[PDB]
Amino acid sequence: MVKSKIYIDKIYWERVQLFVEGHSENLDLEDSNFVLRNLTETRTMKANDVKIDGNQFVCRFNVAILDNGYYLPEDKYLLVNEQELDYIAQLNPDVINDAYQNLKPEQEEEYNELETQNGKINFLLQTYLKEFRKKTVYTVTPEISSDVNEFVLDVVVTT
């Protein structure tokens, strides 16, 4: 009934392993290839593992080694299923709700002063930020990139 689509249902980390759970609508995943692709499409990194159960998928990316034993480079990445077409993963609203349900008290107090839909969405996605310290700080934060109108992972490296 709906156009072929890929959705992200949940994002979480097990230390340096990034997991993305989701599902497709009107799209067989049997010959799918899930990748992170940067905004300019000059770099594509395949998932280290993909498990498919019917229309459900779970992707694992070992972010510490995706670049030939080094960490995923600083960039903005889309999650793409590369089949007959390239299907860019869409965020399921569940991800937004889960962020809201897990706000901490100080976060909740700041969130409650927000007045715009876009501000609320941006705030909630930013609570997913994951930071590694090795002093180099490596942060991975999801967002809706307004320019290309897509969910992305923003990877930023700081000293």
From Swiss-Prot:
Q: From the Swiss-Prot or TrEMBL record, state where the protein is found.
A: Cell membrane
A GO BP entry is: cell wall organization
Lineage, top-rank taxon, reads: Bacteria
Gene Ontology molecular functions: CDP-glycerol glycerophosphotransferase activity; CDP-ribitol ribitolphosphotransferase activity
Keywords from UniProt, A to Z, are: Cell membrane, Cell wall biogenesis/degradation, Membrane, Teichoic acid biosynthesis, Transferase
What are the record's GO terms for cellular component?
A: plasma membrane
- Which coarse location class describes where this protein primarily resides? membrane
What's this protein's function? Answer: Responsible for the polymerization of the main chain of the major teichoic acid by sequential transfer of ribitol phosphate units from CDP-ribitol to the second glycerol phosphate attached to the disaccharide linkage unit. Synthesizes polymers of more than 40 ribitol phosphate units in length.
Please report which protein family the annotation says this sequence is part of: Belongs to the CDP-glycerol glycerophosphotransferase family.
Q: Under which name does UniProt file this protein?
A: Teichoic acid ribitol-phosphate polymerase TarL
Whole sequence portion shown: 1 to 164 of 562
